[PDB]
Chain length 145, copies 4
């Protein structure tokens, strides 16, 4: 037992405040509704990272660009990567016009309510699990800079 | 305001009680630590489904046996399947002696506490998301029959 | 039996002549020793095709550019493609600096000697098997133009 | 000048005689049309090897059983393996009831005629190229033992 709490169903404004509470800086696309997190670019391989809220689910995602020569090998390793974390998911986003991306993300289901403490844990856990995947891909020479 | 609720770091006993409170039936392996969920076998392609507790993370997972002729095509589809759900993950488990398995799972991180209502929602959202993915693979002719 | 013949071990000059014999036009890179075959660009998907001679093996290869979005699906289909022809081979050539290529090729072992008629058959058979693979990839929307 | 030689469109009898002339032993399936080559089992990973004649093309092929845990990694290596030889091809044969197989093969197009000497060279070059590929996969731990 940790006691009684009262749960909140957050909107994006609650999330801005809860991020401000933790001293986590966020920035905000002209082109999207995600809260972008500049500190995540400190991890080798990370080009962008953000918090989205959609259909009752908070998502924390990082994006890295993949070298063309590593794309087939990385696609073959996706099972092992997803199996390697209890909480983080990984997949490729491939377009004809861009460099292929590796998306690495964790969700927190919010529609039933959350405490602030649960959000904080999620931010900490996600950052740690995400950066592990992405740094290991970088160190294996799979990513551009 | 709204009401107050208990925040609990659960052990496997907390979860069995919580499943009981939802009238969800669970069975046990003498060979594993998970709580098996017989009702998930009503979706085609599901050979087993279970709740595990691992380092403070609850995992609800479904397992389906994959057709060897569909193993490579499924492996090539994992990005798109993982991209199809906000919450569920999918991956392959391949051994040298068993048929390959598709694991389809959702997690709920319990180390900072959880409430009963969050678990309930987890059980519902996971059953829905997991069953969609498995039913879809089964309809794509990728799975063997239980 | 088709009678007695006398075999020739060709060099690149024999091959130019044998191509001239069949009225097949060839062109010649500043950057390679292959004999390039412009008529093969008449097949949808083909960016270049050539005859190489190396270490006693004549190779007839065509190259097509693959869309990034089709690269993973095509890599998964390489077994089926190679299984589909008795004589043609297919594989990807992927570089970080370029568009991925699909290489589709047939060899003729020449170190033991050949007749002209065997060369002609090879040119005909290769062109037919190669263009089948490449046109089927094009029609399945796997290639750029 | 150099000498003259017979140009022959072969049938399977022409090939058996030609293998005999090279003292290469061949056996037969009551279940297939190929001439099996017992000496190819001396290379590790080779479960079978054979000469087929199909639409006027001679195929020399070797078969190795693939470890299910290496199936996906091998599939991802096929480009590089096919690019490693000027003449040999490699691909997978996956069924729902057998272990997956790696086929490694070379062809010789016979419809415009072949001479005995071209066949001999074919037999030597194929054995060399095919065995290199198979021995290499076996050393990469991809294959099961015959």
């Amino acid at each position: 037992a940790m006691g009684m709490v009262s749960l909140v169903v957050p909107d994006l404004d609650v999330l801005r405040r809860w991020l401000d509470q933790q001293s986590i800086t966020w920035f905000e696309c002209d082109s999207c509704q995600a809260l972008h997190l500049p500190h995540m670019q400190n991890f080798d391989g990370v080009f962008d990272a953000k918090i989205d809220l959609m259909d009752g689910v908070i998502l924390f995602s990082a994006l890295a660009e993949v070298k063309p020569t590593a794309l087939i090998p990385l696609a073959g390793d996706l099972s092992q990567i997803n199996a390697s974390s209890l909480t983080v998911k990984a997949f490729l986003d491939i377009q004809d016009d861009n460099l292929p991306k590796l998306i690495v993300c964790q969700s927190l289901s919010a529609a039933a309510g959350l405490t602030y403490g649960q959000f904080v844990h999620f931010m900490k856990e996600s950052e740690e699990q995400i950066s592990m995947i992405v740094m290991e891909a970088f160190a294996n020479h799979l990513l551009m800079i």
